[PDB]
mmCIF file of the N, C-alpha and C atoms, coordinates in Angstrom:
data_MODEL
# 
_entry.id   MODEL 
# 
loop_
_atom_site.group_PDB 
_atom_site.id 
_atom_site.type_symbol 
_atom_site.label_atom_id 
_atom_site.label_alt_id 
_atom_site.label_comp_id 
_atom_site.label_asym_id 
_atom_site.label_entity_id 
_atom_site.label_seq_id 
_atom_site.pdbx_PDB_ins_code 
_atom_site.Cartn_x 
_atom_site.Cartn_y 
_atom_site.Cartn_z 
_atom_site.occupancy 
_atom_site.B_iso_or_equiv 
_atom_site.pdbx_formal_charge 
_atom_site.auth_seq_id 
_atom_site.auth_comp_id 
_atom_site.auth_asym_id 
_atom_site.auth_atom_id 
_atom_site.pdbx_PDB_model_num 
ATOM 1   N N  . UNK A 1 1  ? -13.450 193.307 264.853 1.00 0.00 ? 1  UNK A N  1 
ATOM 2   C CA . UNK A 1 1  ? -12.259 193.704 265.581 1.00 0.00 ? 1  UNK A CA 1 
ATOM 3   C C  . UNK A 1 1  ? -11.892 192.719 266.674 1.00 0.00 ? 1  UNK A C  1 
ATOM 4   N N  . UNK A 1 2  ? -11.780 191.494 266.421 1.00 0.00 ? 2  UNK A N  1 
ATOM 5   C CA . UNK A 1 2  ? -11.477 190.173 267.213 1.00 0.00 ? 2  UNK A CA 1 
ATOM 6   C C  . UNK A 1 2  ? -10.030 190.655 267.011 1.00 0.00 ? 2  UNK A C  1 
ATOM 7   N N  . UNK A 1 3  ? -9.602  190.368 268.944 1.00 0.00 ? 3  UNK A N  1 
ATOM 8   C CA . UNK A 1 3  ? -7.909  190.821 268.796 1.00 0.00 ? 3  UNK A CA 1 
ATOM 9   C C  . UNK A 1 3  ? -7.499  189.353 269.052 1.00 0.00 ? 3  UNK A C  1 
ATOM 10  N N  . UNK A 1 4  ? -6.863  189.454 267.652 1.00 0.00 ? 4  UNK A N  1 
ATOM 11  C CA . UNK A 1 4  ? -6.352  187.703 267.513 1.00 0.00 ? 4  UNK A CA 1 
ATOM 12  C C  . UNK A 1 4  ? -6.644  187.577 266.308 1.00 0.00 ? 4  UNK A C  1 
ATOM 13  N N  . UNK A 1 5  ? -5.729  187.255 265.139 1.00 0.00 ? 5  UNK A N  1 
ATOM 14  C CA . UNK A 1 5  ? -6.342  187.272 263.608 1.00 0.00 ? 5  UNK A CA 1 
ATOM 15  C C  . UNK A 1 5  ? -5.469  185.544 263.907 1.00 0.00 ? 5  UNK A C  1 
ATOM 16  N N  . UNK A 1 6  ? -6.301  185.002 262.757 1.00 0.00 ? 6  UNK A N  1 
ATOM 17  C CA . UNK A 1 6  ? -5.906  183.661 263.007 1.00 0.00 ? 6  UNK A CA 1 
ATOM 18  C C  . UNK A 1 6  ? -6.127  183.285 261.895 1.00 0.00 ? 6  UNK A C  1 
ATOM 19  N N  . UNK A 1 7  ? -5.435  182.600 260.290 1.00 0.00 ? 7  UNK A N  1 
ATOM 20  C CA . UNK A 1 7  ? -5.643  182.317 259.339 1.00 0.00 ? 7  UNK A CA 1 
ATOM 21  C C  . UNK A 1 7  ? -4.814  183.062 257.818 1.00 0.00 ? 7  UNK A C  1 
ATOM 22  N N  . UNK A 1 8  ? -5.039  184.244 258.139 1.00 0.00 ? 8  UNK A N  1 
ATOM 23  C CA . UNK A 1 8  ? -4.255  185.343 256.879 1.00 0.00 ? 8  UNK A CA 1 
ATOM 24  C C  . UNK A 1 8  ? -2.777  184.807 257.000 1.00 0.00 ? 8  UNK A C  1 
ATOM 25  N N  . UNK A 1 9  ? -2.388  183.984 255.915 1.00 0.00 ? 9  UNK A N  1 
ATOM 26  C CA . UNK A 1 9  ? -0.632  183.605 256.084 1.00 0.00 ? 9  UNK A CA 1 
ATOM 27  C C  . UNK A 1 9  ? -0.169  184.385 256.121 1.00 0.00 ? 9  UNK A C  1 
ATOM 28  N N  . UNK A 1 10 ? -0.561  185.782 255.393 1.00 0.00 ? 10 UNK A N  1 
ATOM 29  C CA . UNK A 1 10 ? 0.401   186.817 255.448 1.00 0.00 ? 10 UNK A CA 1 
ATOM 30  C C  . UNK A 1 10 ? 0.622   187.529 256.883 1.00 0.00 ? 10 UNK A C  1 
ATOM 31  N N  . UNK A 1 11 ? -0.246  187.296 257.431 1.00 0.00 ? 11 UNK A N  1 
ATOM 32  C CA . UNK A 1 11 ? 0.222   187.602 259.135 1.00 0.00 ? 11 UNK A CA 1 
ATOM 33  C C  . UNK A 1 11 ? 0.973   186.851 259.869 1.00 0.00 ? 11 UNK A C  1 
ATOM 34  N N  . UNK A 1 12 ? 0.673   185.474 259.637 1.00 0.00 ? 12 UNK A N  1 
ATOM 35  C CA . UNK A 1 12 ? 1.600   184.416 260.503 1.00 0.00 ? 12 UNK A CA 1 
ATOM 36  C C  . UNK A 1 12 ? 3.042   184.562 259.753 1.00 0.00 ? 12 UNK A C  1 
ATOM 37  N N  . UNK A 1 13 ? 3.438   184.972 258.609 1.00 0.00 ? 13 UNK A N  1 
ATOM 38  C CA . UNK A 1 13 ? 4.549   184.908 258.689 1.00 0.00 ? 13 UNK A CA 1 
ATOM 39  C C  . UNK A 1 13 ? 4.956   186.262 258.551 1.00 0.00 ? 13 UNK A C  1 
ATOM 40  N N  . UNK A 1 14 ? 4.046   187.195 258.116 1.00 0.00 ? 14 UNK A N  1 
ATOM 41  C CA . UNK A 1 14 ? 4.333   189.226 258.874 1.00 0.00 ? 14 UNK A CA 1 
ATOM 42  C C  . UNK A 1 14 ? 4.502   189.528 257.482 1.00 0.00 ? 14 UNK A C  1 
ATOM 43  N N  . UNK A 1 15 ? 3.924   189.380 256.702 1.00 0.00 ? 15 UNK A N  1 
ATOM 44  C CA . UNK A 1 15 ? 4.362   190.128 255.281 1.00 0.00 ? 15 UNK A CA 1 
ATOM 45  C C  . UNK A 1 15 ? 3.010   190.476 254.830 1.00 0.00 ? 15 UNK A C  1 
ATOM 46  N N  . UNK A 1 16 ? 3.072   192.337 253.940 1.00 0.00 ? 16 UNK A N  1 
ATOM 47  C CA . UNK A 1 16 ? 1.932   192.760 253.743 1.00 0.00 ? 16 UNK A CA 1 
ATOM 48  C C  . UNK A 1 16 ? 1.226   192.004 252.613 1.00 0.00 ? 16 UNK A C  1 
ATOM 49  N N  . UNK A 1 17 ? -0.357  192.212 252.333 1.00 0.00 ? 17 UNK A N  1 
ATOM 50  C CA . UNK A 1 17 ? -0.779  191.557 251.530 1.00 0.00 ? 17 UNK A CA 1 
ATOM 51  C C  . UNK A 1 17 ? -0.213  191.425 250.118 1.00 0.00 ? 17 UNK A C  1 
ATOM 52  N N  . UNK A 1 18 ? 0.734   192.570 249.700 1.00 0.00 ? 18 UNK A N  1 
ATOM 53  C CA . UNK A 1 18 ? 1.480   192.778 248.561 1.00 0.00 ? 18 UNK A CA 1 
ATOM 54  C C  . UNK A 1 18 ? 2.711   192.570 248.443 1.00 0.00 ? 18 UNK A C  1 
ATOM 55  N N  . UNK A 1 19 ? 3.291   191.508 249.183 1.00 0.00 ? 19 UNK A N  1 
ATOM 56  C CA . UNK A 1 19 ? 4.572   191.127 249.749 1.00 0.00 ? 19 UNK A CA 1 
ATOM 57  C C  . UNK A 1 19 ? 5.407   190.401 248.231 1.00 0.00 ? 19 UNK A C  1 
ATOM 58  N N  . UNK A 1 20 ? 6.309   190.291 248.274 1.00 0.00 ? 20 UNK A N  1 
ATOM 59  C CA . UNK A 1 20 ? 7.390   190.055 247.306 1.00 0.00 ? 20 UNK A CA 1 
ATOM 60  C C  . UNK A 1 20 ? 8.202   188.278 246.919 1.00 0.00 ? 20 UNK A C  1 
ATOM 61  N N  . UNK A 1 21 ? 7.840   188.010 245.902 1.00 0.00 ? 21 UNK A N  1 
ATOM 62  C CA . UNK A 1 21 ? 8.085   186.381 246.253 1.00 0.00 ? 21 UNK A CA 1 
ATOM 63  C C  . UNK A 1 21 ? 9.689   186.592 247.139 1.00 0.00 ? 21 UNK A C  1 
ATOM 64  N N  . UNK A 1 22 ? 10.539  187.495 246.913 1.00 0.00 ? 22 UNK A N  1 
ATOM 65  C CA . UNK A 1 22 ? 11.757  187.528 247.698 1.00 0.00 ? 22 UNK A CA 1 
ATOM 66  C C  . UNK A 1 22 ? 11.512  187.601 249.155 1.00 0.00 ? 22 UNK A C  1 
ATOM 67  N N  . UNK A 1 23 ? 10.392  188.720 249.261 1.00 0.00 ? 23 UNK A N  1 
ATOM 68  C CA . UNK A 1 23 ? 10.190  188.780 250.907 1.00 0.00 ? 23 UNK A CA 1 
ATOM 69  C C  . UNK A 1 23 ? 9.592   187.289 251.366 1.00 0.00 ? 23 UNK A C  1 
ATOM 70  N N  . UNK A 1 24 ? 8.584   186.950 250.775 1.00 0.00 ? 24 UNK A N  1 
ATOM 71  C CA . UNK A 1 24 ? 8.040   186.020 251.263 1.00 0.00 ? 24 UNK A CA 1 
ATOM 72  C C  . UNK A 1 24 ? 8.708   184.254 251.644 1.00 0.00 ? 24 UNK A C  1 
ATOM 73  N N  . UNK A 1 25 ? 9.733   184.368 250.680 1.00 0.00 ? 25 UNK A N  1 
ATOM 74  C CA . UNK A 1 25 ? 10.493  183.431 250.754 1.00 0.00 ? 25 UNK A CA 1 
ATOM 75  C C  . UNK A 1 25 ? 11.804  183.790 251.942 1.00 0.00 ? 25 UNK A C  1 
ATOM 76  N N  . UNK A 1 26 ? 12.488  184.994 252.188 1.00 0.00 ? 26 UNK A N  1 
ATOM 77  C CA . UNK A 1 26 ? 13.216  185.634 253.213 1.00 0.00 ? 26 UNK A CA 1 
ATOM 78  C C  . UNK A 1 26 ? 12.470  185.086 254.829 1.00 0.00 ? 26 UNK A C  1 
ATOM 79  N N  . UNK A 1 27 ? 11.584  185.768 254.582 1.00 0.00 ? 27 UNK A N  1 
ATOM 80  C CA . UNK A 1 27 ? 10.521  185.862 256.036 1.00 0.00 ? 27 UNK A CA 1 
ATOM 81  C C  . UNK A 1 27 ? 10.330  184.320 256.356 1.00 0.00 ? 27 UNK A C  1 
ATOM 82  N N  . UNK A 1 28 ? 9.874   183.395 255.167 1.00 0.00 ? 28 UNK A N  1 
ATOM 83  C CA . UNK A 1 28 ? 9.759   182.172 255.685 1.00 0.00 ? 28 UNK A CA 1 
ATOM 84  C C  . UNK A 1 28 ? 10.449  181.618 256.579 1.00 0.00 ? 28 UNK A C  1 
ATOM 85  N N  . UNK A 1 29 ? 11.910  181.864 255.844 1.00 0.00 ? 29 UNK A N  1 
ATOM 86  C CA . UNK A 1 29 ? 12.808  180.723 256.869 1.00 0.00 ? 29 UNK A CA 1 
ATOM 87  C C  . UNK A 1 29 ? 13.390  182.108 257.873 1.00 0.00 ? 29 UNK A C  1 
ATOM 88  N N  . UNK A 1 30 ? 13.414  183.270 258.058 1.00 0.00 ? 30 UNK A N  1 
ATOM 89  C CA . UNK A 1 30 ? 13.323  184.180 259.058 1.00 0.00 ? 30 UNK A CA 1 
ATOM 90  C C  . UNK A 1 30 ? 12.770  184.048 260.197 1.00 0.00 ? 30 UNK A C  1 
ATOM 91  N N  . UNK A 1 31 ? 11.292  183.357 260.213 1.00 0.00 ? 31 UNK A N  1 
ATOM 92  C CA . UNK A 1 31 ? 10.046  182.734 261.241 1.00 0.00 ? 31 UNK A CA 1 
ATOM 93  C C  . UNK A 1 31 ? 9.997   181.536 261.401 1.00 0.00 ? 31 UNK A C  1 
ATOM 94  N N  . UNK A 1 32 ? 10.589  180.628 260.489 1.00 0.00 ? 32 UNK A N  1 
ATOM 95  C CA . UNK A 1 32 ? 10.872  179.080 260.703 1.00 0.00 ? 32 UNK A CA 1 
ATOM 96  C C  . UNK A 1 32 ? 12.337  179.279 261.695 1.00 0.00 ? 32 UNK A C  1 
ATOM 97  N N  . UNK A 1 33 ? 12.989  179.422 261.672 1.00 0.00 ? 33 UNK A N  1 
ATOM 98  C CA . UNK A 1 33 ? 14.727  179.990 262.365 1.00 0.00 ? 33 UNK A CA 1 
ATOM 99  C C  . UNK A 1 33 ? 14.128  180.200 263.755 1.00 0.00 ? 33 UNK A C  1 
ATOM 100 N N  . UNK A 1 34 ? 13.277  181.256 263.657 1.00 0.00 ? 34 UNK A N  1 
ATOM 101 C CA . UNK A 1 34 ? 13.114  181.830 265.016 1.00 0.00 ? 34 UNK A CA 1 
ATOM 102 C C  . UNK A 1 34 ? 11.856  180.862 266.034 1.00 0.00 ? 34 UNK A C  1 
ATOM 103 N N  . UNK A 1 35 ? 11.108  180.127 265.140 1.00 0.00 ? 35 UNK A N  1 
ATOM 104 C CA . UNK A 1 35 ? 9.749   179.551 266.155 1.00 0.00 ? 35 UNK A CA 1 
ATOM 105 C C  . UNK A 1 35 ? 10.268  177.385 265.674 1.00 0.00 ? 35 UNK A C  1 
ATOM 106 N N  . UNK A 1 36 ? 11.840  177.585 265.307 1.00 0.00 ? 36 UNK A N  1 
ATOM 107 C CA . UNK A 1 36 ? 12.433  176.379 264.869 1.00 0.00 ? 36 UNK A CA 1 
ATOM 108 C C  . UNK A 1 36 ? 12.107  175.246 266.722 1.00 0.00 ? 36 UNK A C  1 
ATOM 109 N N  . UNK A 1 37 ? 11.598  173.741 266.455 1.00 0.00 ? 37 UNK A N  1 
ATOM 110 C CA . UNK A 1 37 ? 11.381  173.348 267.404 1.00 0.00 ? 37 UNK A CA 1 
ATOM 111 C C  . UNK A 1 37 ? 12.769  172.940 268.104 1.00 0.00 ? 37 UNK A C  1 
ATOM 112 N N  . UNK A 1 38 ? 13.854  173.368 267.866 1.00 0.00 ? 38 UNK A N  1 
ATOM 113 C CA . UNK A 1 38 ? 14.722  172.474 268.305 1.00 0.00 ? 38 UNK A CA 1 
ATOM 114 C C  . UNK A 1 38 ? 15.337  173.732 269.285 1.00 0.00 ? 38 UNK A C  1 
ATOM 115 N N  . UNK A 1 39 ? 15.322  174.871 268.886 1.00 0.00 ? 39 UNK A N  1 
ATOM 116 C CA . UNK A 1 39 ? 15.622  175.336 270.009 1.00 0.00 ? 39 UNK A CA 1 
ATOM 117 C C  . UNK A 1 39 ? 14.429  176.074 271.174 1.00 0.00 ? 39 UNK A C  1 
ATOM 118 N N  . UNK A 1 40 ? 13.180  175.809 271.128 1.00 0.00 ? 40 UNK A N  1 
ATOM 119 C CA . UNK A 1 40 ? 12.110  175.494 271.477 1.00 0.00 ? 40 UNK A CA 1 
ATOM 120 C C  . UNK A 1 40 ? 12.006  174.576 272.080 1.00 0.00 ? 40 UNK A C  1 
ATOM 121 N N  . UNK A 1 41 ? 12.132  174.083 273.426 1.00 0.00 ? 41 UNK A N  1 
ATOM 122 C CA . UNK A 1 41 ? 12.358  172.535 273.900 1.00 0.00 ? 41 UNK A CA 1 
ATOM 123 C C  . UNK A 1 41 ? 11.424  172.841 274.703 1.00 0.00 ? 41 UNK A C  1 
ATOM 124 N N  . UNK A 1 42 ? 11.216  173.380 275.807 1.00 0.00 ? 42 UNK A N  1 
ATOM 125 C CA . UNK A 1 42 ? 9.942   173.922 277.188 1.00 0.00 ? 42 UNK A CA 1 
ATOM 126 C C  . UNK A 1 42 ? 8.644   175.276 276.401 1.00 0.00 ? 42 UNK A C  1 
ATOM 127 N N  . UNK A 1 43 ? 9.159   174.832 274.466 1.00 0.00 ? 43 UNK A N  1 
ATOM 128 C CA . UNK A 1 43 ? 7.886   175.319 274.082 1.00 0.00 ? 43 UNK A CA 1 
ATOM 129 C C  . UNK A 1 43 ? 6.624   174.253 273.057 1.00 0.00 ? 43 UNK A C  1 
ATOM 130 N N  . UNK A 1 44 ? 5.783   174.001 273.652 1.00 0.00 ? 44 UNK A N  1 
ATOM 131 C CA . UNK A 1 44 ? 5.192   172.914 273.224 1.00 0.00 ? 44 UNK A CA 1 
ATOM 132 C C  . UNK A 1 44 ? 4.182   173.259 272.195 1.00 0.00 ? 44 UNK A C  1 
ATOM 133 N N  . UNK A 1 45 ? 4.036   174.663 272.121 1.00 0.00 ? 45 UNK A N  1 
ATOM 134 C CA . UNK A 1 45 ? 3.204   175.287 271.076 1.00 0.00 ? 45 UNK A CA 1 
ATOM 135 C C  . UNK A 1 45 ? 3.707   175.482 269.911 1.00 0.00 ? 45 UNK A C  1 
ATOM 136 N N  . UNK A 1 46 ? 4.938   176.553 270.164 1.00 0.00 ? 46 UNK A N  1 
ATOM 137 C CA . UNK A 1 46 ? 5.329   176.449 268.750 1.00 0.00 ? 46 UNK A CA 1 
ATOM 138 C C  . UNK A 1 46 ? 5.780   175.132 267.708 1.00 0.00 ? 46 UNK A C  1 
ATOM 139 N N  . UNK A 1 47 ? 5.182   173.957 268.348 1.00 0.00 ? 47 UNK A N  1 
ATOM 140 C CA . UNK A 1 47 ? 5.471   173.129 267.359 1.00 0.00 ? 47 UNK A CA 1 
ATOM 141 C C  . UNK A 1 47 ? 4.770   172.834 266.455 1.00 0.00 ? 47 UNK A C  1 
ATOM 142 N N  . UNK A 1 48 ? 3.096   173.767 266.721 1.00 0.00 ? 48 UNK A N  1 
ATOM 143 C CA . UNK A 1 48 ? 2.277   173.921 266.354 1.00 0.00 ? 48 UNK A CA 1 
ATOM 144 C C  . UNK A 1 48 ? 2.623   175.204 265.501 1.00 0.00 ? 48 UNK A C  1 
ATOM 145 N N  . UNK A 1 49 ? 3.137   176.153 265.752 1.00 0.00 ? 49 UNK A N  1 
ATOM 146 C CA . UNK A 1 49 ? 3.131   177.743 265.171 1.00 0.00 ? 49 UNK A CA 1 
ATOM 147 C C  . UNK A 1 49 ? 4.082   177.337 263.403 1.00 0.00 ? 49 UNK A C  1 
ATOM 148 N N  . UNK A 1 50 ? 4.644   176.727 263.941 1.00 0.00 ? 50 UNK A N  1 
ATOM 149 C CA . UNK A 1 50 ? 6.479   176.105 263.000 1.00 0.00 ? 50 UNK A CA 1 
ATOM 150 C C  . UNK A 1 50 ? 5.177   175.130 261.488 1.00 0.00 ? 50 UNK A C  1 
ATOM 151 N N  . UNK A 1 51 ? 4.471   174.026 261.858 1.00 0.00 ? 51 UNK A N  1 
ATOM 152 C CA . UNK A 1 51 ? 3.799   174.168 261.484 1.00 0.00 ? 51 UNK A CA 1 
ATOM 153 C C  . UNK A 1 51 ? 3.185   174.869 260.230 1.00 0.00 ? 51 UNK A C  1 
ATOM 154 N N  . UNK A 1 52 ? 2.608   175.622 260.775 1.00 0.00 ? 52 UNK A N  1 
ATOM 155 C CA . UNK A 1 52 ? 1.648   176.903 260.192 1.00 0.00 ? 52 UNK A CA 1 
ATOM 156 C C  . UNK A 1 52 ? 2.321   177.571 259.113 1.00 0.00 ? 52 UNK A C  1 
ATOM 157 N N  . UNK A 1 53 ? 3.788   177.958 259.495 1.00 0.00 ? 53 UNK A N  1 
ATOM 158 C CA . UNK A 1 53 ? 4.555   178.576 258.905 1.00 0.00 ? 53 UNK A CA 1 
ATOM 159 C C  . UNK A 1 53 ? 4.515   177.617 257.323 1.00 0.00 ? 53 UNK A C  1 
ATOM 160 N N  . UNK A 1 54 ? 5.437   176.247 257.620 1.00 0.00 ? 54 UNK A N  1 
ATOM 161 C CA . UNK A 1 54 ? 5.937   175.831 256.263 1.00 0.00 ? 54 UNK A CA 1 
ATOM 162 C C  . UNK A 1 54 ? 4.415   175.726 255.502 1.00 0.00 ? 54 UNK A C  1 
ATOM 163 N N  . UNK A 1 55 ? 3.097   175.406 255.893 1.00 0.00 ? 55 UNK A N  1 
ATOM 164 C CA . UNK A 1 55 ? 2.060   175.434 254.994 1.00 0.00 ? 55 UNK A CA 1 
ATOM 165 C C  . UNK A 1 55 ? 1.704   176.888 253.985 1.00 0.00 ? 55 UNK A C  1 
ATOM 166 N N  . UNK A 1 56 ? 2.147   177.521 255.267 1.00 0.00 ? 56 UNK A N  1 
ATOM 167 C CA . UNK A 1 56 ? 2.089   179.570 254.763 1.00 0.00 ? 56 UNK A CA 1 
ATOM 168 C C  . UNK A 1 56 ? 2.670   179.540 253.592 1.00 0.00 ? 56 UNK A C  1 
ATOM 169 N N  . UNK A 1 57 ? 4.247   179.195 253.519 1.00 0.00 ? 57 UNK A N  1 
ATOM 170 C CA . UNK A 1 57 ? 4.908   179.262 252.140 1.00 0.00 ? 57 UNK A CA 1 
ATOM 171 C C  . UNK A 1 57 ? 4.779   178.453 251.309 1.00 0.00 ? 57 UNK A C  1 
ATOM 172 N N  . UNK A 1 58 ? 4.445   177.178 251.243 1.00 0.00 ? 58 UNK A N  1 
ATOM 173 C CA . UNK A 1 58 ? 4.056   176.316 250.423 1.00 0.00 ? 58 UNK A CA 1 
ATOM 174 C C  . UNK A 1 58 ? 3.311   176.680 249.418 1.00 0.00 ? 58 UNK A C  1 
ATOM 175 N N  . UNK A 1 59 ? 2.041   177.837 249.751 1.00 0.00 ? 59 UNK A N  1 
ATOM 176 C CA . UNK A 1 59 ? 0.966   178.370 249.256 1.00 0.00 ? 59 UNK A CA 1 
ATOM 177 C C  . UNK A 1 59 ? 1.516   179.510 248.509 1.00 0.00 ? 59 UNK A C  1 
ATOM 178 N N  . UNK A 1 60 ? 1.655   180.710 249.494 1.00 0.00 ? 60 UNK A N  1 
ATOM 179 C CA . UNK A 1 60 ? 2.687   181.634 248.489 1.00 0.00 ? 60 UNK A CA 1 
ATOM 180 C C  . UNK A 1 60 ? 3.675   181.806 247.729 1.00 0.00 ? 60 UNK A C  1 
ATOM 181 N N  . UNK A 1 61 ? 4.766   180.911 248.140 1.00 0.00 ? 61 UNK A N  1 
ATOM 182 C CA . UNK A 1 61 ? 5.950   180.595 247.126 1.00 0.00 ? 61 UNK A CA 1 
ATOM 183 C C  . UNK A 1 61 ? 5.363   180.143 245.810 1.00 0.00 ? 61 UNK A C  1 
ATOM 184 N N  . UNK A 1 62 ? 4.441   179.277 246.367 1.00 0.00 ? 62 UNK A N  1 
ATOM 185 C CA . UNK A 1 62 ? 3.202   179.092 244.834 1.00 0.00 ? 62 UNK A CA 1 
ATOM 186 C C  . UNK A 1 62 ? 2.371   179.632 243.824 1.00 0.00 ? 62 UNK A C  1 
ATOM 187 N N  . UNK A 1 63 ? 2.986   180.116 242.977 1.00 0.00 ? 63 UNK A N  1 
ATOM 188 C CA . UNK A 1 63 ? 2.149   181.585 241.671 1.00 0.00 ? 63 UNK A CA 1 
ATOM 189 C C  . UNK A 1 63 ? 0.529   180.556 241.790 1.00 0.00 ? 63 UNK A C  1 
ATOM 190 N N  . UNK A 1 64 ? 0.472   179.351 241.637 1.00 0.00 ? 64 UNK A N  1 
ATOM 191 C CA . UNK A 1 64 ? -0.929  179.309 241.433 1.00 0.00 ? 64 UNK A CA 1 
ATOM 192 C C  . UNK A 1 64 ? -1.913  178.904 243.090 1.00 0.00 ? 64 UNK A C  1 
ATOM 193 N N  . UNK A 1 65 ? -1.284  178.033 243.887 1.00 0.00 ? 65 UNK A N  1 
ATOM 194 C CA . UNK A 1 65 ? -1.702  178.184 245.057 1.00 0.00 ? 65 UNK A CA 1 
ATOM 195 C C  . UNK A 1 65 ? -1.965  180.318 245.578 1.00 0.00 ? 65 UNK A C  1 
ATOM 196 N N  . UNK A 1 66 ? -0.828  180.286 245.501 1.00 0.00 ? 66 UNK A N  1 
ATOM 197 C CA . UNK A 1 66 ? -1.134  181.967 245.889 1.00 0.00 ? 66 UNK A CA 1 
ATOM 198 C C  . UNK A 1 66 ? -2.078  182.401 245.301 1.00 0.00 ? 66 UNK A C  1 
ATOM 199 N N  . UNK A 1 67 ? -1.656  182.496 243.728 1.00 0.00 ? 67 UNK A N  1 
ATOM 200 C CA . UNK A 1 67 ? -3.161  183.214 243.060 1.00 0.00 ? 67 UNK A CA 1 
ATOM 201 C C  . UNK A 1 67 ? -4.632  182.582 243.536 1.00 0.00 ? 67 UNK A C  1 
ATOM 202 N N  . UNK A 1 68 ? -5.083  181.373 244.006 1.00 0.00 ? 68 UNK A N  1 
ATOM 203 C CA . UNK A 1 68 ? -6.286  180.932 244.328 1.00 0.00 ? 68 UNK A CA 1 
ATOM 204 C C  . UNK A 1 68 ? -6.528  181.352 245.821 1.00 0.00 ? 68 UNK A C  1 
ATOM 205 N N  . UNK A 1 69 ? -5.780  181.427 246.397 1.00 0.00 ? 69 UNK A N  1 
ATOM 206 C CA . UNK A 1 69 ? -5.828  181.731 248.060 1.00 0.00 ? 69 UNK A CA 1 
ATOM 207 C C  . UNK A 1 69 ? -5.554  183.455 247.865 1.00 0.00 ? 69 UNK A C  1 
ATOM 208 N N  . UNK A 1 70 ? -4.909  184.042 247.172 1.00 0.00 ? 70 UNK A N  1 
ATOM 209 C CA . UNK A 1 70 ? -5.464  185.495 247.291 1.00 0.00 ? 70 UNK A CA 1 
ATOM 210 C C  . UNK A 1 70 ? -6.924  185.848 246.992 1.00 0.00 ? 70 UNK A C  1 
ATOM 211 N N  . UNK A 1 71 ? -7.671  185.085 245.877 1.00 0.00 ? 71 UNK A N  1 
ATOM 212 C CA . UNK A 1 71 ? -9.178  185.243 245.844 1.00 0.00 ? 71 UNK A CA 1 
ATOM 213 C C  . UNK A 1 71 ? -10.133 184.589 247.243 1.00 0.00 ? 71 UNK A C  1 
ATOM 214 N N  . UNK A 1 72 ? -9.690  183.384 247.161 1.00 0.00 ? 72 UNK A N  1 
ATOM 215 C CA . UNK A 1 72 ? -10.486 182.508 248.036 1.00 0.00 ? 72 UNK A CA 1 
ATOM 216 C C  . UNK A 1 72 ? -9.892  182.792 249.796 1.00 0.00 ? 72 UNK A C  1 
ATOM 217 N N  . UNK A 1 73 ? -8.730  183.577 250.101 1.00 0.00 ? 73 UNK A N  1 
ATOM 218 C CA . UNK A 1 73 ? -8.590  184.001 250.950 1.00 0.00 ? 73 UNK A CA 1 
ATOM 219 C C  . UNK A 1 73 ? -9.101  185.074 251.826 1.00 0.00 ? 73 UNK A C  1 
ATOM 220 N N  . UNK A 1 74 ? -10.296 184.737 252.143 1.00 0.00 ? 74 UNK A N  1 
ATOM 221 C CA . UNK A 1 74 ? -11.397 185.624 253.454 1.00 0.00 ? 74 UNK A CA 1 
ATOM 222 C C  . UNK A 1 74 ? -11.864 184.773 253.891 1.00 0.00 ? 74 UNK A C  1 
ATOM 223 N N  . UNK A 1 75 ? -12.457 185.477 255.236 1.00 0.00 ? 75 UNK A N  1 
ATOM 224 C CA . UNK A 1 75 ? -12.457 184.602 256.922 1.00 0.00 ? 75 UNK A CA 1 
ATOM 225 C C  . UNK A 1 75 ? -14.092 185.157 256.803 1.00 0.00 ? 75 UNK A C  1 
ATOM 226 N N  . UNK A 1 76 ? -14.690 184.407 256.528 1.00 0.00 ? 76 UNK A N  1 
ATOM 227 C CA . UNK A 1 76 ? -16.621 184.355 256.688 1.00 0.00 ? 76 UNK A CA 1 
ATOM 228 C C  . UNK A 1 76 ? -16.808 183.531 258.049 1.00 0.00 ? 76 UNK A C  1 
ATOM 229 N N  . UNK A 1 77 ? -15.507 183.274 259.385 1.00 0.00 ? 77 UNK A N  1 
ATOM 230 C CA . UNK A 1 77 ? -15.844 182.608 260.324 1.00 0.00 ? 77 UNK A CA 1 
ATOM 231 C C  . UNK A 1 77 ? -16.879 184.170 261.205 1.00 0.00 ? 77 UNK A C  1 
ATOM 232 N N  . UNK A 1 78 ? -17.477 183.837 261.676 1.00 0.00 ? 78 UNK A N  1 
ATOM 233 C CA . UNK A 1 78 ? -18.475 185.162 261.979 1.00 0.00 ? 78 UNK A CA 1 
ATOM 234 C C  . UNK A 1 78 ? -17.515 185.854 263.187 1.00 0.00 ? 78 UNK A C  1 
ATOM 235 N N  . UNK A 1 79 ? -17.425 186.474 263.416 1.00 0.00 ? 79 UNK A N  1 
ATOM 236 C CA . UNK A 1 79 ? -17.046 187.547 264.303 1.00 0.00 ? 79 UNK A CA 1 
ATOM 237 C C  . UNK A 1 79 ? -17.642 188.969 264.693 1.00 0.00 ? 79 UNK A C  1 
# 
C-alpha cells in the first residue's frame, strides 16, 4: 500500500486494466493535451510526465506490445 503507484500505464494515463483500444487511444491525447509542454512553461516536470504518456500508448495502442506487457506487466520492485 505504497501511496504513489509508479509504472502501471494504465494509471498514468487513467484507464482501467480492461480499457478499450478507443478509450485508450481518446485518453492518450486527452493527457498529452493536458500535461502538453508548451503550455507548461514554469512546469519542469511534466516534461518528464508528457514523456511517460507517449511511451504508455505506444505499448497499448499495440495488440502485441500490449499483449506482452499485460503478462509481463507486475511491479516485483519490493514494497
Amino acid at each position: 500500500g505504497s501511496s504513489g503507484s509508479s509504472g502501471d500505464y494504465y494509471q498514468i494515463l487513467g484507464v482501467p486494466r480492461n480499457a478499450s483500444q478507443k478509450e485508450i487511444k481518446k485518453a492518450y491525447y486527452q493527457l498529452a493535451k493536458k500535461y502538453h509542454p508548451d503550455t507548461n512553461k514554469d512546469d519542469p516536470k511534466a516534461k518528464e510526465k508528457f514523456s511517460q504518456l507517449a511511451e504508455a500508448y505506444e505499448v497499448l495502442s499495440d495488440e502485441v506490445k500490449r499483449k506482452q506487457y499485460d503478462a509481463y506487466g507486475s511491479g516485483p520492485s519490493s514494497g
